[PDB]
Design a protein around this ligand. Structure first.
Ligand SMILES: O=P(O)(O)OC[C@H]1O[C@@H](O)[C@H](O)[C@@H](O)[C@@H]1O
Ligand SMILES: O=P(O)(O)OC[C@H]1O[C@@H](O)[C@H](O)[C@@H](O)[C@@H]1O
Ligand SMILES: [Ca+2]
Ligand SMILES: [Ca+2]
Lengths: 485, 485
């Protein structure tokens, strides 16, 4: 294929994410013939390590991904390490050395990507010294990959944006969101724009409501310390859920270039309504899991590191409103929580019921287009047909499709897609500042209420699909969650 | 259920159709609790038979449909026979007797259905004497069920219509067409009108072309004598194919009453264009099967009773044009032939390809909605999605649905539907005069050409899906048959 000439620097190169997801993803791009001669990977962290010692760390990361050892050993020759304190300007000179040493050794003309798998407080500092200490390439491109999370509130997000803006341009900033890097999610645009019958129907005159579901069957497990302060609201809703909503709510672009794609998404984001105390209580529902029917499924308050008086949300559900001609009055429902009935990430477009009177007892019901993203990709379409009865009557049938095994292990995991796309300069599957600022303003209004506790905290049994309020929320507009479990 | 009080008279009550399809169908309506006390079945034909002897004929017809013998014996008590010459006015008095004897015995107030399973030349005569010899009920309803065929040309059809019009009103005349009585065919209206996304797309701005396919894998087998003069044109195209096209081409009705349904269909029929010699050659293709790759699959000219110089068509394919705003320029392709690749009766709505440029190598292709009627009902929908590749690209996926076993043997066979519908006065699944006259005018223009041999007779190997001209026909408008075999 066309060789990808690039140099990647991994900050936090000894961390678990680097070992478990980053290196294997890079290794695959080598296996697929993208990365060949002209490429180098410089790892960096606070721990001391020999170039010999680092290579073994990488050798371990890809052990399970290795078929031909000679192939692995060849890939590993492109790796170098350097111990480094990110808060020390003088220490960056050592890092610049390793980077330029690599650029010479493999003959790479610029094209540098800086990945930051470090704690969120080091983001601004690092970005600053890459520019001032001369690490940015004078030729080719310079791109920065910012890990999750990009702020914890609009204010902190804006600060980060400002710090980063001091060394890079917005189009060089690649904010990570693994959900946006999921193959099935990228099908949304193809299904809509690729088929006129759906394209011309993606509006208020055809849709009754839209549903986004990021259901998890796991509890807090071990990340309770950090989670208790974030909750489902900032952990799944603010980031993953809002960005999926962006692909669904967006206007029709003028082209499929990332520039127009974002213009189309931002048009919708700029129309999203921000709620006040009263609206939050009416449109949103927060809850936390209690014990299920199994003693093994203990309540949230009994999890390790969780404070006994915690009013944190392990589940969130609510209605979104877009003040756009296209979505005038159409409800966008979203939900995400832990200890639910099943692991599932899906989108459900509920079309309006037809008004053609068939004279029958059972008249036409609402059609549904479902796009299952996790655990396994699948596309279903519920349509109205005739019942197998004597007197003419209608019923709903489900047409379905599921990814083949050929499709499955041939599909690129999110981290590979993101790294690959950054190397190609394609920001199509990445969130931009405008999208992130709006999502933060949306979530902040809600959090303020919760923080002040001017809204109730519901409860639900571990194993259900949420509290009953979640159902009542939709019933008010005459709707119901498609996925029941 | 609500009891159906009716009296049915079967002309040709000793024939094969009566034994194989008519009586079992009636028996089912008894089994389903529709026919109870107030109903009688008077058989009639030219052969002499005791009421005892006739009952055994019926006892045989339903043998394979009998579970509880006591149930069968109870059904059989409603049957009576009378030998009768249909060309003898004086003989009708004997028939009137049996009918009134039955009306008294089971207490039936009129509601008479007269079924004619006799040779087409007796149709007019019979109808005449039912009125003049006083067999029509003075109360309730009087309906006549005319078997296939209703004429062999427009002229002969019109004559039949005139003769029948002398004793009945058009709405009392139920013309038989078992294809229109097929469960899946009746789904067409539900899929279209029942789902707005399809309803608003059933026009020229969305559809590229429509395909109707009545494929048969059998050859002439034994009915070669009658077939050699009819061909696929009058055997499958004129009747079955045109009526399925009627459900597809029809306008949106003002209600689902049979009156409006027909008004909607007739609106399309009245717009169907009739071809001249030149147009027939361009838009239609006729052919007859030769030997396949198997010696066992002998050519048409080697079939029993087929003349060695026969220029008869065992296969027909062509393009239909409707001069209606709704279908302006949209081609309706139809095909039917013997000795083809597989037994199949389906409809394929080919939607236009989208023009949204994805920047990809493979741009959006045309979506397809397929409704499989025979051998087993199924609904498929080909949509555009994203390919499992690295660079963004589209591909076509097939979403499918198939009738369950629960649905299958629970579904009413065509003859049961037709008889039942006639008892209910529902002409929705029946062709009317306007539809039949147009189909005849359409086919006559074509036959005139063939009869004069001013068009070529193609050939095809037994087992293919037709001659190559069939493909070229669609290629001209940039189309292709969806079903390949
Ligand atoms: O479906 P996936 O990719 O496992 O995503 C779920 C995970 O998404 C991550 O973003 C959250 O931090 C985790 O808490 C969560 O479990
Ligand atoms: O699909 P079906 O109902 O068997 O229909 C096919 C038959 O239809 C009948 O109308 C024709 O006279 C037969 O020649 C033909 O074989
Ligand atoms: Ca409301
Ligand atoms: Ca043409």
């Amino acid at each position: 294929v066309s060789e990808i000439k690039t140099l990647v620097t991994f900050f936090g190169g000894t961390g678990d994410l680097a070992k478990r997801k980053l290196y294997p993803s890079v290794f695959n791009l080598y296996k697929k013939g993208y990365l060949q001669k002209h490429f180098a990977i410089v790892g960096t962290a606070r721990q001391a390590l020999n170039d010999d010692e680092f290579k073994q760390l990488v050798r371990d990361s890809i052990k399970d991904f290795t078929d031909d050892q000679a192939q692995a050993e060849a890939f590993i020759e492109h790796f170098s390490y350097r111990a480094h304190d990110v808060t020390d300007a003088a220490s960056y000179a050592v890092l610049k050395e390793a980077i330029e040493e690599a650029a010479d050794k493999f003959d790479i003309d610029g094209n540098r990507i800086f990945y930051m798998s470090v704690a969120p407080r080091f983001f601004g500092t690092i970005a600053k010294y890459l520019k001032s200490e001369g690490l940015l390439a004078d030729t080719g491109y310079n791109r920065l990959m910012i890990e999750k999370p990009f702020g914890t509130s609009y204010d902190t997000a804006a600060e980060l944006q400002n710090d980063l803006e001091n060394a890079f341009d917005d189009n060089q900033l690649f904010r990570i969101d693994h959900y946006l890097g999921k193959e099935m999610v990228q099908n949304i645009a193809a299904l809509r724009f690729g088929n006129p019958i759906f394209d011309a129907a993606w509006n208020k005159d055809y849709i009754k409501n839209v549903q986004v579901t990021l259901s998890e069957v796991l509890g807090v497990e071990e990340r309770a310390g950090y989670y208790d302060t974030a909750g489902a609201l900032l952990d799944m809703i603010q980031n993953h859920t809002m960005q999926i909503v962006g692909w669904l709510a967006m206007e029709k672009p003028e082209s499929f270039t990332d520039k127009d794609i974002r213009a189309a998404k931002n048009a919708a984001f700029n129309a999203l309504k921000i709620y006040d105390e009263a609206e939050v209580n009416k449109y949103f529902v927060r809850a936390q899991y209690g014990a299920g029917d199994s003693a093994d499924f203990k309540p949230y308050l009994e999890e390790l590191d969780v404070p006994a008086d915690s009013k944190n949300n392990t589940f969130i559900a609510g209605e979104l409103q877009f003040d756009l001609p296209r979505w005038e009055g159409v409800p966008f429902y979203v939900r995400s929580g832990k200890r639910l009935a099943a692991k599932q990430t899906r989108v459900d477009i509920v079309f309006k019921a037809g008004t053609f009177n068939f004279g029958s007892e059972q008249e036409a019901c609402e059609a549904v287009l479902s796009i299952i993203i996790d655990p396994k990709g699948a596309i279903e379409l519920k349509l109205n047909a005739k019942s197998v009865e004597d007197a003419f009557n209608t019923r709903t049938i489900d047409l379905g499709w599921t990814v083949s095994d050929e499709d499955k292990k041939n599909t690129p995991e999110p981290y590979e897609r993101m790294i690959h796309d950054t190397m190609n300069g394609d920001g199509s599957n990445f969130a931009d500042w405008n999208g992130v600022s709006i999502a933060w303003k949306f979530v902040d209004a809600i959090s303020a209420v919760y923080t002040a506790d001017k809204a109730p905290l519901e409860t639900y049994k571990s194993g259900s699909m949420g509290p009953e309020a979640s159902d009542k929320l939709l019933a008010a507009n005459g709707d119901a969650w498609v996925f029941k479990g």
